[PDB]
Design a binder for these strands. Structure first.
Ligand SMILES: Nc1ncnc2c1ncn2[C@@H]1O[C@H](COP(=O)(O)OP(=O)(O)OP(=O)(O)O)[C@@H](O)[C@H]1O
Ligand SMILES: [Mg+2]
Length: 223
DNA sequence: AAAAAAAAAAAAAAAAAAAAAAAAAAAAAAAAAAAAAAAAAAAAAAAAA
């Protein structure tokens, strides 16, 4: 997991078409969706964090929100990102995940050991947190994601533990529209069942809009 | 009268069994507490004219 030949990387860097090769090289098992692929590649590379003085933090993380009507490979995109990214962890708005968004402290079920079970937002501090079914979160999960995605920290006050612990993750989320079908007559905000503060903390909003197109349908079916 | 004897007869030392005294003496199991987590019942706050 350590690189010895920077030389090949740099040779590819001079290819002058490395960008389109990179974009075409993500989620190879998903047909189409090139704009989502550009956005996911950008997020996967990320920007530059910066903090003038020590008082004006600006993240370099590119958070991406895929909102699209069902059966449009959103979860497959998140699984691809989990495969490629180092320090990627996967979580869901339902209860069907090993890690949960919110930190808690408890005795571990298999260890029997009193453990600060830091959430999925801080387990991905230097990496990416993948939240599937983003619109189906708790109120607790929602305030957790809001704190991590605004402050890039998680504040515990549970047992005797008063700590703040860092969650500098890129959040990539997939959500479904309200009613299970994206309505382009409405704005994105009134389609998704997420509050404005949550949506504003995303750089890229990919509307994965599903339409009947015989050529695209045929290519996808062949795939 | 003293001169050999020839015993008591005392001492030191030994034995010599008794019968009493002296000297040795952690690790294994249990329970209780305090803490957890879990099935059930119970008590809250969002729904609409
Ligand atoms: N463009 C595509 N290319 C390749 N496979 C696709 C594409 N679109 C859908 N699929 C396939 O359709 C199936 C459904 O995908 P997926 O579960 O990712 O959809 P989803 O957006 O998560 O749906 P939901 O919103 O219901 O969770 C997947 O197995 C995926 O392989
Ligand atoms: Mg899905």
């Amino acid at each position: 997991l350590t690189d010895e030949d920077v030389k090949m990387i740099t040779s590819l860097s001079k290819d002058q078409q490395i960008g389109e090769k990179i974009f075409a090289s993500i989620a190879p098992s998903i047909y189409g969706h090139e704009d989502i692929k550009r956005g996911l590649a950008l997020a996967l590379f990320g920007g530059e964090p910066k903090n003038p003085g020590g008082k004006h933090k600006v993240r370099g993380d590119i958070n991406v929100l895929l909102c699209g009507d069902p059966g449009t490979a959103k979860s497959q995109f998140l699984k691809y990102i989990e495969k490629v990214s180092s320090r990627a962890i996967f979580t869901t708005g339902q209860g069907a995940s090993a890690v949960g968004l919110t930190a808690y402290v408890q005795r571990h079920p298999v260890s029997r050991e009193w453990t600060l079970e830091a959430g999925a937002l801080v387990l991905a501090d230097r990496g990416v947190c993948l939240i599937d079914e983003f619109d189906k979160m708790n109120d607790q999960d929602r305030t957790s994601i809001h704190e991590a995605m605004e402050q890039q920290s998680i504040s515990i006050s549970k047992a005797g533990i008063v700590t703040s612990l860092q969650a500098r993750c890129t959040v990539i989320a997939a959500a479904n529209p309200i009613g299970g079908r994206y309505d382009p007559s409405l704005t994105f905000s009134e389609n998704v069942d997420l509050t404005e503060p949550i949506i504003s903390r995303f750089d890229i909003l990919c509307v994965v809009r599903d339409t009947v197109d015989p050529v695209q349908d045929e290519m996808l079916a062949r795939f």
